Amino acid sequence: GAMGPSSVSGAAPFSSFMPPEQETVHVFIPAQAVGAIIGDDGQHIKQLSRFASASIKIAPPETPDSKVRMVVITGPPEAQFKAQGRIYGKLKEENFFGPKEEVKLETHIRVPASAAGRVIGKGGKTVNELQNLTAAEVVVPRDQTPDENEQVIVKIIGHFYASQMAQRKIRDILAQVKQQHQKGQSGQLQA
Template identity: 25%
Template sequence: MRCLIVTQDASVIIGKAGKHVNEIREKSGARVTVSESIPGNPERILHVSGALDAVSKAFGLIVRRINDEPFDVSSVPGSRAVTIKFIIPNSRMGTVIGKGGSKIKEIQEASGARLNASEAMLPGSTERVLSVSGVADAIHIAVYYIGNILLEYQDRPAAGGSSRDTYRQAGGRESYGGDRREERREPRAPGIDISGPGVQTQQIFIPNDLVGSIIGKAGAKINEIRTASSTQIRIMEPGQPGASANTDERLVTITGQPTGINMAIQLLYQVRSDPPSLFFPRTRRLTPPFCLVF
């Protein structure tokens, strides 16, 4: 994902001798680069690439760096909202906006960020600007949803081969993360029916030290949450396809009706009194419609 940033913010992101940008790369797992400064041009291009989880996390860290906030705490009331101006191809902007602005509205409600798509294309370009404003956590979540929509656009079949093949030929293979075919084979929890229309899937990351509390003795706690929410909940083991590259956290997949998913997330949060923002939401749409649960 690419965006325009003012030169002053670019300098803050890079840091002395690249210290700050190297820290962002290390903590997110994404590749972060900033274009050279052009005399007379007040903006530079920030390019963040990698798996979608890593890219969205990197933008959250970038906002924290701009605001001079710690990387390891959630955004607090009073945190300054930062605007990131993403560069989106005009051919894809409609997909991000949605019919009548429905997608933008859903992303705003899910993330707490504010989105605004420019009507005009950039001078001499076929691209437009999507401005995303919010605190670090809001930007992190919004970027994930936007990136997910863009990846789904790439997955649509095209004449002469799939657009995913075209994307890979262009060097974008790493942006796909886990194997979606593996995710579709996810086993269901015994005794819980998650079939029927409207079934969706939400994925969140949780700290490793919380896993034991969530599972409970002989799986009692997680089964209690499954039953109460009528959802299927799966905690992935490290090293499985699609699992987090960060060894300090685990991926939890929740499948069911939207109301049940919301309940399951709330029950998971209640297992321990950590701030909800410590659970970085990750969403992959496995079944329609687009899942926006937070």
């Protein structure tokens, strides 16, 4: 029986992150490409937000290990495709990634912690089909604790069109999981 208040939790002065309005993708481009993207008087990002109909932020350093920086691509399926096309377009013009190859940028999208095997599929068939046929590769970290929403990240490395078919096959399987999570009882079912 409850008598006194148990667990409240407010704001943490240790870690603070601003949540966007609509749905969000987080696109990992080179830290040698932020000077590219923010570079034009700091007006190319203020450009992509008006231009791509989307809501673009730049994010701080991930880690010393990460030579990228994360771009906040918020907005509809139309405005999301319009903005990322530019960030893939800019590495396409400069080839910041690796002169010998073509654009292969990392995508972070929050997905449910016990649904991280849904995005990878049957053992590694969604990672195998995406890597080989799509060149966009699904990644889910080892020392991975979930977020607030009980959500973990997955990291695709592909082109604009490759991360396109990969990101969408992910949010669909993750939908079909959300279908099996909400919907359970169907028909009559005998014991």
